[PDB]
């Protein structure tokens, strides 16, 4: 039986699995009312990818495909798998792997290389709350400030940068899933929702702050596990020996345990903490796997 392990990368050496960002802080919010069911950064402890989760950091919230036509200035785009193969809607996934898992106006760059080839690139926005956001149906829409310089029938790539806005009319909600097949159809093959099942416990998040094209705000993206953990768990494929792994957040310089947490088999952390907000901890700290435990084990208060 291959031993379970975690990467020994510190907090400053980790990346968000729901948007291409470095991990900035650890974060808790016990008062969260929304159901937590993100689809990216989802991996079981024995290495099973779930939701729309794929391995590439470049793949997160990225799209690949071809623009069909113009529809401000809006463009329609068929989306493929990230490796260029066509997306098959009959596959047991919510949407093409890497598809954004939250509501909002995602800001980025659309670039094209014609089938020496000609090229062009412009800033673009993808509204994931829009009815015409249907990645599960192989089709999405994006808008540009540019009015004419986008080519139909040519290979197209979306590089995510941040959010367009977090104003009220931009509908940013990190815990609200998109309608992958659009209106009047239900999402399918979703990674399961996650929650603490023990009193006095709350979810522990890896939090990253996300750039804005304009306007006011300090928006953040919280992921259950950093992308490096996803990559690590997938390769090892170590059998889980109970339903909860006990991990300690350790200061390597001093050898001190800052706190302990439960790493659940579905791939998320809980801690015994009453307070909301960022976690005061060294950025060179890291989680260390110490043993497989069960519900009889009680986490020390944080």
């Amino acid at each position: 039986s291959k031993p379970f392990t975690l990467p020994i990368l510190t907090l400053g050496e980790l990346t968000n699995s729901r948007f291409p960002l470095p991990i900035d802080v650890l974060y808790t919010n016990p008062n969260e009312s929304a159901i937590v069911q993100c689809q990216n950064g989802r991996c079981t402890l024995d290495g099973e990818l779930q939701g729309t989760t794929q391995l590439l950091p470049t793949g997160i919230c990225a799209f690949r495909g071809k623009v069909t036509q113009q529809v401000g200035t809006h463009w329609n785009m068929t989306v493929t798998n990230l490796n260029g193969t066509p997306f098959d809607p009959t596959e047991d996934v919510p949407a093409p792997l890497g598809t954004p898992d939250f509501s909002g106006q995602i800001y980025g760059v659309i670039s094209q290389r014609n089938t020496l080839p000609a090229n062009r690139a412009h800033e673009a926005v993808i509204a994931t709350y829009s009815p015409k956001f249907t990645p599960k149906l192989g089709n999405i829409q994006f808008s540009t400030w540019e009015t004419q310089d986008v080519s139909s029938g040519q290979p197209t790539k979306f590089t995510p940068v941040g959010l367009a806005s977090v104003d009220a009319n931009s509908h940013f909600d990190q815990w609200t899933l998109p309608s992958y097949s659009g209106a009047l159809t239900l999402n399918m093959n979703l990674a399961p929702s996650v929650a603490p099942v023990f009193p006095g416990e709350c979810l522990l998040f890896f939090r990253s702050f996300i750039p804005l094209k304009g306007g006011y705000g300090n928006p953040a993206i919280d992921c259950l596990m950093p992308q490096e953990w996803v990559q690590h768990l997938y390769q090892e494929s170590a059998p889980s020996l109970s339903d909860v792994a006990l991990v300690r957040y350790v200061n390597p310089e001093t050898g001190r345990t800052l706190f302990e947490a439960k790493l659940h088999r579905n791939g998320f952390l809980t801690v015994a903490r009453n307070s909301a907000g960022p976690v005061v901890a060294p950025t060179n700290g890291y989680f260390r796997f110490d043993s497989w435990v069960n519900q009889f084990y009680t986490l020390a208060p944080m």
Partner: nanobody, 120 residues
Framework: DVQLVESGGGLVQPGGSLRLSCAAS????????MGWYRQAPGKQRELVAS???????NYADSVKGRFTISGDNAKNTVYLQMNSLKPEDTAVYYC??????????????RGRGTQVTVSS
């Protein structure tokens, strides 16, 4: 295997106190949780109190504020200080221990149990 030696049972005047002790020996691991369960006459098993190696503790609502669990790691022993005892606390009290490893599933052990009677 792991062995648990219980002690501290008996008859106690209501409002009084009792101290139970459970000492673990054998193939014990550094990461663990020890606790007490009890079974009142004509009733089913219930968790009383538990303590974990990381220092976390769990109490049943019925005994919160009256009972205190603690341990002396040097002796591999846990203690249950039961204060302000009432007749409804009358039960057989059982010691339970879970030993944890990075390389194996959790392993459980249990004690024979001790009778605690609160009356008169």
């Amino acid at each position: 295997d792991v062995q648990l030696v219980e002690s501290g049972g008996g008859l106690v005047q209501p409002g009084g106190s009792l101290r139970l002790s459970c000492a673990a020996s054998g193939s014990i691991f550094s990461i663990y949780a020890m606790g007490w369960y009890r079974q009142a006459p004509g009733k089913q098993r219930e968790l009383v109190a538990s303590i974990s190696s990381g220092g976390g503790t769990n109490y049943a609502d019925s005994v919160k504020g009256r009972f205190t669990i603690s341990g002396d790691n040097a002796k591999n022993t846990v203690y249950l200080q039961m204060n302000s005892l009432k007749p409804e606390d009358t039960a057989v009290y059982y010691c339970k221990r879970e030993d944890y490893s990075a390389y194996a599933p959790p392993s459980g052990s249990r004690g024979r149990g001790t009778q605690v009677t609160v009356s008169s």
